[PDB]
Amino acid sequence: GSMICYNQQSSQPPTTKTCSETSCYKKTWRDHRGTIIERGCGCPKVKPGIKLHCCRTDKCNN
Amino acid sequence: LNEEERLIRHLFEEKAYNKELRPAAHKESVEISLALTLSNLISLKEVEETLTTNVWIEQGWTDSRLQWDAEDFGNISVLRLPADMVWLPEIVLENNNDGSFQISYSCNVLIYPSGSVYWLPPAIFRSSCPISVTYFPFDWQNCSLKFSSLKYTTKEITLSLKQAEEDGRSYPVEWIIIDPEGFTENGEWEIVHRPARV
Amino acid sequence: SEAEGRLREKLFSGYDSTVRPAREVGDRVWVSIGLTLAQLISLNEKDEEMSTKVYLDLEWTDYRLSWDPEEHEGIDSLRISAESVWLPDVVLLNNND
Amino acid sequence: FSSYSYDSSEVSLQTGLSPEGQERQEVYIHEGTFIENGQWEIIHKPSR
Amino acid sequence: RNQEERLLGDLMQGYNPHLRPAEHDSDVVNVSLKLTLTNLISLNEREEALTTNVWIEMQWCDYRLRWDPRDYGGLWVLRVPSTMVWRPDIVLENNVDGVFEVALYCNVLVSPDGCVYWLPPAIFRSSCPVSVTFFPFDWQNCSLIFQSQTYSTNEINLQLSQEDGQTIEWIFIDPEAFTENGEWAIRHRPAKMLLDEAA
Amino acid sequence: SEHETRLVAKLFEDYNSVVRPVEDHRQAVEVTVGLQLIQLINVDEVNQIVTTNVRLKQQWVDYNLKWNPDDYGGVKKIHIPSEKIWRPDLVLYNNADGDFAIVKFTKVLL
Amino acid sequence: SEHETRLVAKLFEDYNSVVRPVEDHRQAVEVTVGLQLIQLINVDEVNQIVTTNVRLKQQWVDYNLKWNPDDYGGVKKIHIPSEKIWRPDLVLYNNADGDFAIVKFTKVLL
Ligand SMILES: *[C@@H]1O[C@H](CO)[C@@H](O[C@@H]2O[C@H](CO)[C@@H](O)[C@H](O)[C@H]2NC(C)=O)[C@H](O)[C@H]1NC(C)=O
Ligand SMILES: *[C@@H]1O[C@H](CO)[C@@H](O)[C@H](O)[C@H]1NC(C)=O
């Protein structure tokens, strides 16, 4: 069992990788300079104040 | 170096920039936009009644002398200058209790072709936070960081909050910015509210 | 402001900030001193020392820094860095540190 | 508070008049923004 | 002062204090070093810091500061600010508080042969790892490591000072003027010059 | 000697410490950063502060500080005060209560 | 203050603060030193350090800072910064952990 996730940063050109997990995640937060979006595998535990979106479909984190 | 040095020589030697003069007419006020980022909360000493903070203060203002058209300088769109070369509003913490009014590290300013000046000095500040001991050790405290200019009055500068944008709509940043990913909570103090006011 | 710059250059041509303003020899400089207590920080008894935060209020007259406002587009006040003008050497005499 | 170097023949001192004026002899405390010390109460605050 | 001012003006013509004195290439500036301890202030064990009051005697020679006394009315010595001459940037490497440098930048004494004498005083907080096994009946071996911050062994030759025929391989202590520390007695006080051969 | 003096006179005749030292403003400055930890001074658990003694080695190339050694008596390396030149503004981002940037401006080897 | 401005400009136009203020280099500078004790702050018996508040009155004649008052409107006494003149380098030899010399450069009465 495998899956295709996205992993690019923010508004960079899209890239993909092979997740061995059953979810792909998008992680959004905002520091003083602007908004950061991190994409990857699984469903990580995030610190408070961070938007998280986990999804169980191919190419689902964008 | 060529366009950078050319632009510096155009702005500061050819135009004869004077850092002692405000970037405004004599009867006009300069709009300073302020935001605060709390890097980390060091301590609140109860006996000494002192809040210690690491804060990055973001100052923005338009200087109409420090502007250029990018097409005459090789499409250069940003310049980094020492803070000692430009006019500064000289924003200080009036609430300090140790005499350290000023920011800690006087970093470079960033100037842009529009004449906008961006400055993000970091600072370590010791301020007076009066302590309410009534419900100790189940107490909560209300500390403040009061920023103003002792060199200029309301006629000379006008303080305001930073205006950020979301989906093309502007809003004033009415809170202390804390980076959620990089913030480490203080060992004994949790933060409940972070408002900001003019 | 350009007129502010010309006024500043006019006032500080030949101005020495280390020289007390006295138009005649024997003239006194009348300095008026007040104080505003922002915060009474502490009274440390073991050190016998009172810590305060204050704002001084120092008023005097420098005859060298006068101008006609109608000759400079109505400018009647200036904000000049303290190192550029003659200051009275007012200090707290009974400081403990 | 005094001039460290200049003597009375050069710099003459006087008490600072407040916005009230009228030959004040007092330390000025702005009553709105002044938080009293938790250990100390200011009974008198003159100036001479 | 006219001869002194004349000599200073003639000496400071074209003098760069930030350039090491070398008359020919591959010249190494010899620097002799002596340390006088005036009082051992303390040894804080919880910070592992030895606080000491020292006077460091540095002697080197600068060919650019040479002059003939007969051309200047028999002037045989000149007191110059230490900022205006070239200096070997000797620092206490093992400092615990971040103060590498001397406390007071006094005058140097330049002689007609160009040989410069400098005796700045210093307060030094140095790192002393405390061996705690026999506390409070313990003895400690504290170190003060002095080296150039910027120059290498092909540029300066840092050595111990030589008095009349004998190298001073110890911390000098005034017998008359020394007041013993109230908690520490100095049993040995040697000095060494270390140069790793493979460095 | 006179050759080191002549060299330093020429290198800092038309030098600008504010300008990034590259030929073209569109290329970045390449800085190599290394950290040497000399001593772990203290770990303080209450305020969550680690104080350490470090050396912060920084290596880059200044385009405007080149010379031919044959025109200066064969001098290949010199020592310059760091205040005279452009430097990277390295800052400890997670600084707690210490210094954000370098305050001890020692000499550079050029 | 035009007279005093003229005098101060005249006095420090050819003045060198490094060498001693003596017409001939073979005569010594006569300095009168007095100590005023304002406050005995502390006696530290452990570290054996006495902390005191003092004023260090130093008096001496500068050969090149003389003038005729008739050429300057009758100005006989002035106050000048101490950093721009030669001074004695008075050091406290038995300084424990404070300042070896004067660090607060108040005004000179001339
Ligand atoms: C610089 O110091 C070195 C020692 O570190 C001196 O070298 C020796 O000096 C003795 C006495 O003059 C000679 O007998 C030896 O032959 C020297 N050895 C070497 C390494 O040559 C050296 O002379 C000193 N230089 C100056 C200019 O005084
Ligand atoms: C900058 O970019 C514009 C894009 O239209 C181009 O026309 C121009 O030649 C470029 N260079 C300069 C120096 O303006």
PDB file of N, CA, C and O in Angstrom, chain B residues 1-5 8 40 42-43 54 56 74 76 80-82 85 104-105 122-124 185 187, chain F residues 14 16 18-20 22-26 47-49 63-64 89 91 93 95-98 100-101:
ATOM      1  N   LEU B   1      27.739  45.190  -7.375  1.00  0.00           N
ATOM      2  CA  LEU B   1      27.885  46.469  -6.623  1.00  0.00           C
ATOM      3  C   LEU B   1      27.423  47.680  -7.423  1.00  0.00           C
ATOM      4  O   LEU B   1      27.085  48.710  -6.839  1.00  0.00           O
ATOM      5  N   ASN B   2      27.427  47.554  -8.754  1.00  0.00           N
ATOM      6  CA  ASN B   2      27.384  48.735  -9.614  1.00  0.00           C
ATOM      7  C   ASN B   2      26.098  49.527  -9.413  1.00  0.00           C
ATOM      8  O   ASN B   2      26.136  50.726  -9.112  1.00  0.00           O
ATOM      9  N   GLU B   3      24.947  48.866  -9.534  1.00  0.00           N
ATOM     10  CA  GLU B   3      23.685  49.577  -9.369  1.00  0.00           C
ATOM     11  C   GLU B   3      23.409  49.908  -7.911  1.00  0.00           C
ATOM     12  O   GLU B   3      22.827  50.956  -7.623  1.00  0.00           O
ATOM     13  N   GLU B   4      23.838  49.052  -6.984  1.00  0.00           N
ATOM     14  CA  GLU B   4      23.653  49.343  -5.565  1.00  0.00           C
ATOM     15  C   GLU B   4      24.442  50.585  -5.161  1.00  0.00           C
ATOM     16  O   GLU B   4      23.906  51.501  -4.522  1.00  0.00           O
ATOM     17  N   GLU B   5      25.721  50.637  -5.546  1.00  0.00           N
ATOM     18  CA  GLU B   5      26.551  51.793  -5.229  1.00  0.00           C
ATOM     19  C   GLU B   5      26.064  53.035  -5.964  1.00  0.00           C
ATOM     20  O   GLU B   5      26.075  54.140  -5.404  1.00  0.00           O
ATOM     21  N   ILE B   8      23.028  54.293  -4.045  1.00  0.00           N
ATOM     22  CA  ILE B   8      23.399  54.933  -2.784  1.00  0.00           C
ATOM     23  C   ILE B   8      23.987  56.315  -3.044  1.00  0.00           C
ATOM     24  O   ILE B   8      23.651  57.285  -2.351  1.00  0.00           O
ATOM     25  N   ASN B  40      10.015  35.494  22.594  1.00  0.00           N
ATOM     26  CA  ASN B  40       9.892  34.623  23.753  1.00  0.00           C
ATOM     27  C   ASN B  40       9.695  35.473  24.999  1.00  0.00           C
ATOM     28  O   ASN B  40      10.177  36.605  25.080  1.00  0.00           O
ATOM     29  N   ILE B  42      10.656  35.813  28.702  1.00  0.00           N
ATOM     30  CA  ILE B  42      11.740  35.327  29.553  1.00  0.00           C
ATOM     31  C   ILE B  42      11.250  35.100  30.977  1.00  0.00           C
ATOM     32  O   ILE B  42      11.326  33.985  31.502  1.00  0.00           O
ATOM     33  N   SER B  43      10.757  36.150  31.629  1.00  0.00           N
ATOM     34  CA  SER B  43      10.378  36.023  33.028  1.00  0.00           C
ATOM     35  C   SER B  43       9.471  37.172  33.438  1.00  0.00           C
ATOM     36  O   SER B  43       9.416  38.218  32.785  1.00  0.00           O
ATOM     37  N   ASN B  54      11.597  39.422  25.011  1.00  0.00           N
ATOM     38  CA  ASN B  54      12.299  39.510  23.735  1.00  0.00           C
ATOM     39  C   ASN B  54      11.256  39.821  22.669  1.00  0.00           C
ATOM     40  O   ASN B  54      10.404  38.977  22.367  1.00  0.00           O
ATOM     41  N   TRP B  56      10.489  41.745  18.761  1.00  0.00           N
ATOM     42  CA  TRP B  56      10.934  42.323  17.498  1.00  0.00           C
ATOM     43  C   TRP B  56       9.885  43.346  17.090  1.00  0.00           C
ATOM     44  O   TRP B  56       8.738  42.983  16.808  1.00  0.00           O
ATOM     45  N   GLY B  74      19.057  49.441 -13.051  1.00  0.00           N
ATOM     46  CA  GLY B  74      19.119  48.016 -13.327  1.00  0.00           C
ATOM     47  C   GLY B  74      18.023  47.201 -12.679  1.00  0.00           C
ATOM     48  O   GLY B  74      18.267  46.058 -12.272  1.00  0.00           O
ATOM     49  N   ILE B  76      16.632  47.427  -9.818  1.00  0.00           N
ATOM     50  CA  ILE B  76      16.834  47.149  -8.399  1.00  0.00           C
ATOM     51  C   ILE B  76      15.582  47.561  -7.639  1.00  0.00           C
ATOM     52  O   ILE B  76      15.091  48.688  -7.779  1.00  0.00           O
ATOM     53  N   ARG B  80      19.300  47.671   1.257  1.00  0.00           N
ATOM     54  CA  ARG B  80      19.559  47.547   2.686  1.00  0.00           C
ATOM     55  C   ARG B  80      20.573  48.607   3.083  1.00  0.00           C
ATOM     56  O   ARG B  80      21.655  48.685   2.489  1.00  0.00           O
ATOM     57  N   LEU B  81      20.220  49.416   4.079  1.00  0.00           N
ATOM     58  CA  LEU B  81      21.047  50.524   4.532  1.00  0.00           C
ATOM     59  C   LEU B  81      21.222  50.451   6.040  1.00  0.00           C
ATOM     60  O   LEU B  81      20.346  49.930   6.730  1.00  0.00           O
ATOM     61  N   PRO B  82      22.333  50.948   6.589  1.00  0.00           N
ATOM     62  CA  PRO B  82      22.411  51.076   8.048  1.00  0.00           C
ATOM     63  C   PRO B  82      21.353  52.032   8.576  1.00  0.00           C
ATOM     64  O   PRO B  82      20.995  53.017   7.929  1.00  0.00           O
ATOM     65  N   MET B  85      22.113  55.862   8.817  1.00  0.00           N
ATOM     66  CA  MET B  85      22.143  56.703   7.627  1.00  0.00           C
ATOM     67  C   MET B  85      20.812  57.373   7.311  1.00  0.00           C
ATOM     68  O   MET B  85      20.803  58.343   6.545  1.00  0.00           O
ATOM     69  N   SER B 104      17.616  46.905  21.127  1.00  0.00           N
ATOM     70  CA  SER B 104      18.912  46.303  21.423  1.00  0.00           C
ATOM     71  C   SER B 104      19.843  46.346  20.216  1.00  0.00           C
ATOM     72  O   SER B 104      20.925  46.938  20.283  1.00  0.00           O
ATOM     73  N   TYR B 105      19.438  45.729  19.108  1.00  0.00           N
ATOM     74  CA  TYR B 105      20.254  45.622  17.904  1.00  0.00           C
ATOM     75  C   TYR B 105      19.724  46.577  16.844  1.00  0.00           C
ATOM     76  O   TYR B 105      18.591  46.423  16.376  1.00  0.00           O
ATOM     77  N   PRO B 122      15.230  43.974  16.675  1.00  0.00           N
ATOM     78  CA  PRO B 122      14.898  43.203  17.871  1.00  0.00           C
ATOM     79  C   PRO B 122      15.345  43.930  19.127  1.00  0.00           C
ATOM     80  O   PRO B 122      16.225  44.791  19.098  1.00  0.00           O
ATOM     81  N   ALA B 123      14.715  43.574  20.243  1.00  0.00           N
ATOM     82  CA  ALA B 123      14.971  44.256  21.498  1.00  0.00           C
ATOM     83  C   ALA B 123      14.700  43.311  22.654  1.00  0.00           C
ATOM     84  O   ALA B 123      13.857  42.413  22.566  1.00  0.00           O
ATOM     85  N   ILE B 124      15.442  43.526  23.734  1.00  0.00           N
ATOM     86  CA  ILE B 124      15.214  42.875  25.015  1.00  0.00           C
ATOM     87  C   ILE B 124      14.844  43.977  25.994  1.00  0.00           C
ATOM     88  O   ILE B 124      15.632  44.905  26.213  1.00  0.00           O
ATOM     89  N   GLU B 185       6.590  28.122  24.945  1.00  0.00           N
ATOM     90  CA  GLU B 185       5.858  28.725  26.048  1.00  0.00           C
ATOM     91  C   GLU B 185       6.759  28.884  27.267  1.00  0.00           C
ATOM     92  O   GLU B 185       7.657  28.077  27.518  1.00  0.00           O
ATOM     93  N   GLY B 187       7.905  28.788  31.139  1.00  0.00           N
ATOM     94  CA  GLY B 187       7.809  27.654  32.039  1.00  0.00           C
ATOM     95  C   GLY B 187       6.704  27.757  33.069  1.00  0.00           C
ATOM     96  O   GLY B 187       6.259  26.725  33.580  1.00  0.00           O
TER      97      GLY B 187
ATOM     98  N   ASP F  14      37.943  53.926  -2.593  1.00  0.00           N
ATOM     99  CA  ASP F  14      36.590  54.054  -3.121  1.00  0.00           C
ATOM    100  C   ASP F  14      35.729  52.891  -2.637  1.00  0.00           C
ATOM    101  O   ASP F  14      34.854  52.389  -3.350  1.00  0.00           O
ATOM    102  N   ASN F  16      32.912  50.964  -0.274  1.00  0.00           N
ATOM    103  CA  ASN F  16      31.619  51.210   0.356  1.00  0.00           C
ATOM    104  C   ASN F  16      31.241  49.980   1.170  1.00  0.00           C
ATOM    105  O   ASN F  16      30.986  48.911   0.605  1.00  0.00           O
ATOM    106  N   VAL F  18      28.521  49.592   2.798  1.00  0.00           N
ATOM    107  CA  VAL F  18      27.085  49.341   2.742  1.00  0.00           C
ATOM    108  C   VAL F  18      26.740  48.435   1.567  1.00  0.00           C
ATOM    109  O   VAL F  18      25.797  47.639   1.638  1.00  0.00           O
ATOM    110  N   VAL F  19      27.490  48.542   0.471  1.00  0.00           N
ATOM    111  CA  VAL F  19      27.187  47.780  -0.732  1.00  0.00           C
ATOM    112  C   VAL F  19      27.589  46.326  -0.538  1.00  0.00           C
ATOM    113  O   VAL F  19      28.659  46.024   0.009  1.00  0.00           O
ATOM    114  N   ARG F  20      26.729  45.415  -0.979  1.00  0.00           N
ATOM    115  CA  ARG F  20      27.079  44.004  -0.965  1.00  0.00           C
ATOM    116  C   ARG F  20      28.270  43.784  -1.899  1.00  0.00           C
ATOM    117  O   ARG F  20      28.250  44.272  -3.037  1.00  0.00           O
ATOM    118  N   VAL F  22      29.740  42.243  -4.414  1.00  0.00           N
ATOM    119  CA  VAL F  22      29.713  41.423  -5.616  1.00  0.00           C
ATOM    120  C   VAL F  22      29.764  42.352  -6.820  1.00  0.00           C
ATOM    121  O   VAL F  22      29.421  43.533  -6.739  1.00  0.00           O
ATOM    122  N   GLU F  23      30.214  41.803  -7.950  1.00  0.00           N
ATOM    123  CA  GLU F  23      30.328  42.601  -9.167  1.00  0.00           C
ATOM    124  C   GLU F  23      28.967  43.101  -9.634  1.00  0.00           C
ATOM    125  O   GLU F  23      28.816  44.277  -9.985  1.00  0.00           O
ATOM    126  N   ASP F  24      27.972  42.223  -9.643  1.00  0.00           N
ATOM    127  CA  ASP F  24      26.640  42.519 -10.146  1.00  0.00           C
ATOM    128  C   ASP F  24      25.651  42.381  -8.997  1.00  0.00           C
ATOM    129  O   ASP F  24      25.759  41.462  -8.183  1.00  0.00           O
ATOM    130  N   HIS F  25      24.693  43.303  -8.921  1.00  0.00           N
ATOM    131  CA  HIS F  25      23.748  43.284  -7.812  1.00  0.00           C
ATOM    132  C   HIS F  25      22.760  42.126  -7.885  1.00  0.00           C
ATOM    133  O   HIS F  25      22.057  41.881  -6.899  1.00  0.00           O
ATOM    134  N   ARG F  26      22.688  41.409  -9.006  1.00  0.00           N
ATOM    135  CA  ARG F  26      21.746  40.309  -9.162  1.00  0.00           C
ATOM    136  C   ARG F  26      22.272  38.972  -8.651  1.00  0.00           C
ATOM    137  O   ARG F  26      21.492  38.016  -8.582  1.00  0.00           O
ATOM    138  N   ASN F  47      14.055  29.869  33.508  1.00  0.00           N
ATOM    139  CA  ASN F  47      13.828  30.762  32.380  1.00  0.00           C
ATOM    140  C   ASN F  47      14.155  30.120  31.040  1.00  0.00           C
ATOM    141  O   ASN F  47      13.974  30.768  30.006  1.00  0.00           O
ATOM    142  N   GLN F  48      14.632  28.872  31.032  1.00  0.00           N
ATOM    143  CA  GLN F  48      14.823  28.105  29.801  1.00  0.00           C
ATOM    144  C   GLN F  48      15.870  28.757  28.898  1.00  0.00           C
ATOM    145  O   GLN F  48      15.624  29.028  27.721  1.00  0.00           O
ATOM    146  N   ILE F  49      17.052  29.006  29.461  1.00  0.00           N
ATOM    147  CA  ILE F  49      18.116  29.743  28.785  1.00  0.00           C
ATOM    148  C   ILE F  49      19.396  28.922  28.853  1.00  0.00           C
ATOM    149  O   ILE F  49      19.804  28.491  29.935  1.00  0.00           O
ATOM    150  N   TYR F  63      34.540  41.203  -3.614  1.00  0.00           N
ATOM    151  CA  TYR F  63      34.994  41.410  -4.985  1.00  0.00           C
ATOM    152  C   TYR F  63      35.926  42.610  -5.100  1.00  0.00           C
ATOM    153  O   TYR F  63      36.823  42.612  -5.948  1.00  0.00           O
ATOM    154  N   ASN F  64      35.735  43.628  -4.266  1.00  0.00           N
ATOM    155  CA  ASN F  64      36.463  44.883  -4.385  1.00  0.00           C
ATOM    156  C   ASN F  64      37.758  44.918  -3.584  1.00  0.00           C
ATOM    157  O   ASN F  64      38.432  45.954  -3.587  1.00  0.00           O
ATOM    158  N   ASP F  89      25.093  40.124   8.474  1.00  0.00           N
ATOM    159  CA  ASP F  89      24.452  40.506   9.735  1.00  0.00           C
ATOM    160  C   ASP F  89      23.843  39.268  10.390  1.00  0.00           C
ATOM    161  O   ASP F  89      22.634  39.155  10.591  1.00  0.00           O
ATOM    162  N   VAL F  91      22.519  36.866  13.020  1.00  0.00           N
ATOM    163  CA  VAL F  91      21.811  37.059  14.277  1.00  0.00           C
ATOM    164  C   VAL F  91      21.354  35.701  14.781  1.00  0.00           C
ATOM    165  O   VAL F  91      20.941  34.843  13.988  1.00  0.00           O
ATOM    166  N   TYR F  93      18.585  33.904  16.101  1.00  0.00           N
ATOM    167  CA  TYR F  93      17.155  34.177  16.027  1.00  0.00           C
ATOM    168  C   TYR F  93      16.443  33.810  17.320  1.00  0.00           C
ATOM    169  O   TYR F  93      15.519  34.515  17.738  1.00  0.00           O
ATOM    170  N   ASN F  95      17.646  33.962  20.321  1.00  0.00           N
ATOM    171  CA  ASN F  95      18.303  34.584  21.462  1.00  0.00           C
ATOM    172  C   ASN F  95      17.284  34.886  22.551  1.00  0.00           C
ATOM    173  O   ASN F  95      16.180  35.357  22.269  1.00  0.00           O
ATOM    174  N   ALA F  96      17.659  34.614  23.801  1.00  0.00           N
ATOM    175  CA  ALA F  96      16.755  34.785  24.933  1.00  0.00           C
ATOM    176  C   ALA F  96      16.911  36.148  25.599  1.00  0.00           C
ATOM    177  O   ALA F  96      15.984  36.962  25.565  1.00  0.00           O
ATOM    178  N   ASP F  97      18.080  36.415  26.195  1.00  0.00           N
ATOM    179  CA  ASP F  97      18.318  37.675  26.891  1.00  0.00           C
ATOM    180  C   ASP F  97      19.733  38.207  26.666  1.00  0.00           C
ATOM    181  O   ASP F  97      20.161  39.114  27.388  1.00  0.00           O
ATOM    182  N   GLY F  98      20.458  37.686  25.686  1.00  0.00           N
ATOM    183  CA  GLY F  98      21.824  38.092  25.403  1.00  0.00           C
ATOM    184  C   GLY F  98      21.901  39.046  24.232  1.00  0.00           C
ATOM    185  O   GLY F  98      20.993  39.850  23.997  1.00  0.00           O
ATOM    186  N   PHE F 100      21.987  39.877  20.245  1.00  0.00           N
ATOM    187  CA  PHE F 100      21.417  39.311  19.029  1.00  0.00           C
ATOM    188  C   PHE F 100      22.495  39.045  17.987  1.00  0.00           C
ATOM    189  O   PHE F 100      22.515  37.980  17.359  1.00  0.00           O
ATOM    190  N   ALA F 101      23.408  39.992  17.803  1.00  0.00           N
ATOM    191  CA  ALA F 101      24.445  39.938  16.782  1.00  0.00           C
ATOM    192  C   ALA F 101      25.821  39.935  17.440  1.00  0.00           C
ATOM    193  O   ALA F 101      25.953  39.973  18.665  1.00  0.00           O
TER     194      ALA F 101
END
